[PDB]
């Protein structure tokens, strides 16, 4: 049903394929883009931008055209409790330079994301994307932006 994980949880998507607008890093911690993997545990187990604004994004380069049918999101809990993205936008690209915002009924689609730190939330993409690159744009969050992600889809051919 073209809904299988594309490699965030299982590392078929390598660390170098995951980038972001910024990430939170200092002399203690590193919430790197490549930590944005569904169900990841261990230290600093999510992507966090350096500051939480509505201009941040997490990018995945799938390295080939894929039929992308869904996106799964999760937050994270740290010492300062629960952080999660409540709402987000999606954009996509074939070349990584020109980006197309995902729409519903001709208007920007706001996806409803998480309401806690650990439960995964699956969002279908209808119409599906035939694309190489994806960006997640947080627009509402609890405490701070933090994300663990899976991308769902299949090889079109």
Swiss-Prot record:
Localization per Swiss-Prot or TrEMBL: Secreted, Extracellular space
Disulfide bonds: 2-154
Domain F5/8 type C: 2-154
Subunit structure: Interacts with vWF. vWF binding is essential for the stabilization of F8 in circulation.
Purpose of the protein: Factor VIII, along with calcium and phospholipid, acts as a cofactor for factor IXa when it converts factor X to the activated form, factor Xa.
Family, similarity comment: Belongs to the multicopper oxidase family.
Protein name: Coagulation factor VIII
The organism's taxonomic lineage, starting at the top: Eukaryota, Metazoa, Chordata, Craniata, Vertebrata
Residues of the full protein shown: 1974 to 2129 of 2133
